[PDB]
Subunit: 350 residues, 4 copies
């Protein structure tokens, strides 16, 4: 499914390469022989996987704002990629509330900017627009969303993603009609609850837990019974890649929306998770706070990807966790993270 | 019904007051005793109703860009309105195809700005967000859309309205939540009108203006899609709907803080051809038309919610409406007093 | 439009011809020159229009049960009709609650029988399956249902129609497939009408009959649900729709072999109260009403498909309709010649 | 999830007990201590699991037609069950075409008959109405149906099931409103592609294959690439039981529709299946015919059951198959099938 030779030598432009996912993706792709260029603001964190693995060496990197159409246009045109991965985004919900303007301009205008650039420039066979599992109108039900369902979003962040999804659709219809020449294939990819090593995001369950353990402090669990479709970073990333390959060779036929996610079977509680974590950590412990600990959850239906891309996730919760834990320790102990990160990909690739 | 007394003295801020809808609204509103402050770019066209009726002299007209947050916020801040009508937009289809970015920035970020501005300023009781009949994902089918259907849009303009709809519901949810109404005091409604036609519209590529211009200049009008259908309606119709909701939001914010369609009666949802044929007839004196980028074929709106829930109904019929547009255009032509004609239409409507 | 010439000489088999709808249909049909054979149980009520207009003497009326397959099949077989209207049913709500089994057997198996009979007999060109406006899952909302919405039904009657709808589409799919049209030659449509009201209906618990009976006997009519809404329409309205489709199915079976709603214009979908108030007025002479098992509150039908696709539109308004029912009832009362009055209404409608 | 003690001593009335599923269910339930009564026509086949395991000994059995309301009413009233499983049905699609009247009267009128009886009689806490995965309006898509989707069915059999589903709904609304006393809890259960030992149905993939092998003849595979949500007979049956328990103790809250099915992950091709079969058989072989062998499939979304009943399937395709094969051999060799059948349940129960 993931063809190395395919990647070998491809001029790939990725927006938002300095962040978590962008860095894992850029790595992989370079690991594979692709000629990458990144366009983003400086690493969103400290530490930052981007830096930790010294990616500016392995790839061309442009620091810039998605909101500068011209600069953005320029940067791409100079490059002439053939493949584009769009991931620059203001990703926090929390923030989304304080900074709605920022969220929207970044998330919606940036998307518009990007597709319009791709449009004006020309010579792009494949664009993979990264949105979110939150783009969907939230019915607060037990069911996993299908790609044909309505967009929305309750908070600014989620809502911004539903808009980005509308944008990609209109761009596709207006400018890259599959039904017709331009040679541009455009897919919007949806996924969430992404976990792995290199995630220095603040107020994130995994990161937290790890910081906690690392600093020997015990963890306060706010809601033990909460369930999420937790998935290793590489899982969705593989979907994106494959999708990119398909868009490339097959075009139009895959120019559409696509959900990436774990098996329902693989859904664990926060409590379960922290427990495993603990065990996994060794050294590690946690506590239940005084808030309300309530007993449905947002999920995606992956039938279309399984079925039409033959895509399937590879690691089970436990494995992923351990791999997460192991990668953290390595880091902490001063191991070469580029290498370990590399093996991580390698392993997933088997 | 519209309440002239409710309007008296009200501080009303209207974005996009320089346009077709804006001008008619501002005129209506000032005529009712309201204190209106507009914020838009210079008149979209020439001629322009704004200019034609000298509205600038009957209101506080401020020239500015919706994309300039800071400037927008200030404008609002200094006036402290109690009511707001957000109508500024790049409202054209074919153009949106040519200028995608300006369309989205204007329509989308402009809405965000306006709503963020409303949030920061405070003491605003009612917010009426004007979107479009094009916000709905178009299934190209025989049925009028319901408020509960999915947002979308094929072209950048349609799609930008779809996004504007999403934006308002997220602001509503996160910041003007009916739950915490007492905490914010904000009523916010998204209003979706049909295809407004009336005397005083110079917009490019629109049907009636197109028609009026050709007729005027003893030329035949060029028809691109004779069998398309739109929810045709006198410009004053949805305006009445907008006004009514503002009234209701003023006192029962929580309750009417949602989406509303304002369109004609189903029988008024005719084809392009029908209109042009009628218009030819209405004009007379040689009038003729002639047959010639993705546009929707069918577009209808189901208005049972406003009918039942707001108890709002349309006043004029398509034919009556066409007749009135003609009369208006000609009067203008003969150099009649348009402010006076325009005032007359509002009054007649109020009587209808 | 209805085609009197198309009708002439046609062998038409009508199940449930003894009823209200049936009688009006049979009358219409024979009046057009058609050769009608009915198959139903004895008149549903007394009085009965069937009896009142002596239809039995103007057609081949056969008394039989839809649940008796063999008997039904035979009846059809011996007549070899070219057209079929399936209207036999236990059509009442409250009753269905009391008699669930008879309701389902009649409505469901009766449809199966009829369709299986049509299959075995052959040479039938058009089949018009009358279901009900109650076939749709009722979401209790402001919107008229579209042909493409889900079937359901809360009570046994509603639900039996939902099942009757499913049955016809499965027969269509499996046995009268548009694909193999040339192989079977069968056109089959499911028609969903509104709430028919007209002179000549004695059905139990129905509104207008209820009203007419009380008025008649200088008593007040007892109203159970004043604010409910139904798609009120003169009985001749949907009939026209049924007739029109049969015409079309006759020659373009494949093409019109689907579901169709036949209802009034949206403005005619008023409440119970409105009707009774109007009726009081129409009747006069002391007329009054008085306020008093699960029934739907709101029920409307979206008819854009028939409007656009069959080009069918309703002729009379609710008020006109109410007026005509009154006139009819009274004439009857004074001992006027009902066949003649009834013939007159059909003619007037044909003129409308 | 399946409580033995619960079952112990329950007066349970099952319609369609002589057939495949009815016999497995009746067994289990008796295995568990329930006092069962069956109401059905004579065994639909030869051999017949019903006979093979000598069920008339283990349970009360009434031979009768579902279409005789009175008799049916009588039979239940005499019994006073507290739990009712409704499974009498004309189950063949093939037949459904030749015998539409039969199918409908049986499938729809029988259902009406049954619910009305339950109604008139009284004293039934739980009714489990067995429909089919085919009750749904078939959208010919990749997605698994949700319980809230529209009913229909293309052929008479499928369509008959969509009607039965409408019937149960109306009965529930009209007569057993959850929202209100009567103490009747009514669930409609949907499932299909049910496989296992004891299935003597003609023109059924598994049965066939087994007959074939058994008679040393080689098998002709019409469509190798076809995919179905194949599941061991006991899988759905467990759902039914549990559902029954819930309806019983909790009532109304579970008075609704429910889908039972396998994990998507567990979807195999006919070819795959026959291969495994072969291997599994030993002795065994097959051939591809001359028809068209084409490359979406009807499936159900089981989120509601997983989530709200905590229900999950237990055996994987392979296992099920083997168990199928093993049970067949046992039979053939003259082993006591009641016993083996018994162990089958026992095993599933672990
Ligand atoms: N205005 C901007 N211009 C350019 N790049 C930007 C801008 N704002 C943010 N970015 C870049 O976007 C990335 C954000 O990365 P993270 O905070 O690590 O978030 P990540 O988990 O990578 O999220 C990427 C985005 O796509 C979805 O996968 C995800 O949910 C999120 O919304 C970084 O490359 C960051 O510099
Ligand atoms: N960036 C901008 N900043 C401020 N005002 C703007 C901007 N872009 C457009 N406007 C203002 O928007 C108005 C547009 O008016 P018209 O072109 O006449 O369009 P109209 O038919 O009045 O549309 C009014 C409103 O109703 C909706 O149907 C339509 O989308 C628009 O939102 C004018 O006052 C114009 O200056
Ligand atoms: N088992 C039966 N066998 C044969 N005919 C039957 C049977 N049950 C009822 N009928 C016939 O059905 C007809 C019912 O007529 P009405 O009670 O007057 O009802 P009407 O208002 O005419 O309904 C006609 C049709 O339109 C639908 O709205 C309604 O459900 C029915 O299908 C009568 O001719 C009656 O004898
Ligand atoms: N008219 C009838 N009256 C009574 N019982 C009947 C009647 N017709 C069929 N049955 C009984 O129904 C059962 C049919 O069993 P099978 O042919 O083995 O089919 P099975 O796989 O058990 O299917 C049961 C039914 O429910 C669903 O699970 C399934 O898809 C099928 O429609 C037997 O008990 C049979 O005697
Ligand atoms: N010469 C011409 C002109 C027009 N036409 C056809 O008439 C119809 C109406 O088009 P317009 O008047 O431009 O209105 P729009 O419906 O695009 O959007 C309008 O109504 C909805 C609002 O939201 C939007 O802002 C406003 O521009 C279309 O099918 C168009 O192709 C034709 O066939 N020949
Ligand atoms: N005294 C009375 C009588 C009636 N009503 C109300 O008037 C409405 C109309 O009821 P009915 O005339 O009985 O018509 P139905 O709509 O039940 O079905 C009818 O129309 C649809 C057809 O399919 C069906 O066969 C036919 O019976 C209901 O809300 C009823 O409760 C009231 O408030 N007081």
């Amino acid at each position: 499914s993931i063809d190395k030779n395919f990647w070998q030598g491809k001029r790939v432009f990725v927006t938002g390469h300095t962040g978590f996912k962008g860095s894992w993706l850029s790595l992989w792709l370079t690991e594979m022989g692709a000629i990458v260029k990144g366009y983003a603001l400086d690493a969103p964190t400290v530490p930052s996987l981007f830096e930790i693995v010294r990616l500016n060496d392995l790839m061309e990197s442009h620091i810039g704002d998605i909101r500068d159409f011209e600069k953005l246009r320029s940067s791409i045109a100079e490059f002439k990629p053939e493949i584009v991965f769009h991931m620059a985004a203001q990703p926090l919900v929390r923030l989304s509330y304080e900074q709605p303007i920022k969220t929207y301009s970044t998330n919606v205008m940036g998307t518009v900017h990007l597709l319009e650039t791709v449009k004006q420039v020309g010579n792009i066979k494949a664009v993979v627009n990264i949105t979110s599992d939150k783009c969907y109108d939230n019915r607060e039900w037990v069911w996993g969303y299908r790609e044909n369902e309505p967009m929305g979003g309750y908070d600014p962040y989620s809502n911004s993603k539903g808009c980005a999804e509308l944008v990609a659709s209109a761009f596709r219809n207006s400018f890259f009609n599959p039904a017709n020449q331009h040679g541009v294939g455009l897919a919007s990819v949806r996924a969430g609850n992404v976990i792995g090593g290199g995630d220095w995001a603040k107020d994130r369950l995994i990161p937290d837990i790890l910081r906690s353990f690392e600093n020997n402090q015990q963890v306060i669990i706010r809601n033990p019974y909460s369930i999420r479709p937790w998935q290793h970073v590489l899982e969705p990333l593989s979907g994106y890649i494959v999708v990119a390959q398909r868009l490339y060779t097959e075009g139009a036929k895959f120019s559409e929306g696509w959900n990436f996610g774990p098996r329902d079977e693989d859904a664990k509680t926060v409590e379960f998770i922290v427990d495993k974590m603990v065990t996994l950590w060794g050294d590690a412990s946690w506590l239940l706070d005084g808030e309300n600990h309530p007993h449905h959850y947002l999920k995606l239906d992956c039938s279309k990807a399984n079925m039409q891309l033959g895509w399937h996730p590879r690691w089970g919760l436990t494995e992923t966790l351990s791999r997460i834990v192991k990668w953290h320790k390595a880091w902490i102990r001063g191991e070469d993270m580029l290498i370990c990160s590399k093996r991580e990909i390698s392993d997933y690739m088997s």
